[PDB]
């Protein structure tokens, strides 16, 4: 039923010529997003995949200890919408990369993205502020749908414009130790790329959309490491920015990494299709 | 690493 599947995934982390299309689900969130995110299938039988726990926002299981000093965070004092250079946070960021519509910048550098620091609750400045996009949460039309060649796959439902913030990728914060011993490693995505005391995301037990987010070597989204409502730079947090104008019916993509196709690659083969695959 | 990872 709609449960059971993700009952076993709370348990097991517990432990630890084409038919119609089909609404297989209305909403994956459940009402926990602004908006509902629908499941389709116009390919098989299948129904909406359910052996996960769909959540929101990041969970833990072992703690971890991120700093949440209320002292400890940097804000700002501005009297504006925080668009000009006194801004504490947009400095942190470089600038501020957001237009008035929340866009990044055509000088945001997408090979190579800065981190950014949102404003947060210690700021002087307004909840409307210029400095706040990733916070606001999933705004996108989007469809958890069956690909003919590559398992589920999401797609967005409208034009997207370069530079929106799509969606973010959420799961179970564990330790890099931890992640080294996870069964299932498809999910995983790590925070930092250097040595030492670094962490993963694992979205295989506790995820949202984006752990349905197939690998693209020409993507139309790219990762960007955001700071909210905390600066322990041990816990970035992971945004998905439209690197171009994507088209109403495409499906999303991003380029998984070089970490990810290290492994999997001697498995199989990356099907993108992209004349310029690197990966297959 | 043992297990394959994304990453930015
Ligand atoms: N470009 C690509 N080529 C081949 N397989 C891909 C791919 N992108 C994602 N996948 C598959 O999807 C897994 C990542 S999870 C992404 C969602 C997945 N399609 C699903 O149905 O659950 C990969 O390990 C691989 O099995
Ligand atoms: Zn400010
Ligand atoms: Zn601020
Ligand atoms: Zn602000
Ligand atoms: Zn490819």
Redo the contacts with the bound molecule.
């Keep these: 039923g709609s449960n059971s599947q993700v009952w076993s995934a709370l348990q097991m982390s517990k432990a630890l010529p084409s038919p119609v299309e089909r609404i297989v689900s209305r909403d994956i969130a459940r009402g926990y997003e602004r908006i509902p995110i629908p499941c389709v299938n116009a390919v098989d039988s299948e129904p909406c995949?359910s052996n996960y726990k769909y959540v929101s926002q990041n969970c833990v299981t072992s703690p971890m200890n991120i700093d949440r000093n209320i002292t400890h965070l940097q804000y700002c004092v501005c009297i504006d919408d925080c668009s000009s250079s006194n801004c504490m946070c947009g400095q942190l960021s470089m600038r501020c990369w957001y237009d008035k519509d929340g866009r990044l910048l055509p000088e945001f550098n997408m090979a190579e993205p800065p981190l950014i620091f949102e404003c947060n609750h210690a700021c002087s400045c307004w909840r409307n502020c210029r400095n706040r996009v990733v916070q606001n949460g999933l705004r996108a039309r989007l469809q958890l749908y069956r690909?003919r060649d590559?398992?589920?796959?999401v797609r967005s439902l409208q034009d997207i414009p370069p530079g929106t913030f799509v969606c973010e990728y959420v799961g179970e914060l564990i330790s890099d130790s931890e992640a080294d011993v996870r069964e299932e490693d498809?999910?995983l995505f790590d925070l930092d790329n250097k040595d030492g005391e670094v962490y993963c995301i694992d979205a295989r037990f506790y995820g949202n959309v984006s752990?349905?987010?197939?690998?693209?070597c020409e993507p139309n989204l790219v990762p960007v490491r955001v700071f909210m409502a905390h600066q322990d730079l041990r816990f970035p947090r992971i945004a998905f920015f439209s690197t171009r104008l994507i088209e109403a019916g495409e499906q999303l993509?991003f380029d998984?990494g070089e970490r990810f196709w290290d492994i999997?690659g001697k498995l199989?083969?990356?099907?993108?299709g992209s004349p310029k695959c690197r990966?297959s | 690493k043992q297990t394959?990872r994304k990453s930015t």
């Design positions: 995949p690909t590559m398992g589920w796959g498809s999910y752990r349905f987010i197939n690998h693209h993509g998984y999997k199989f083969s990356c099907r993108c990966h | 394959a």
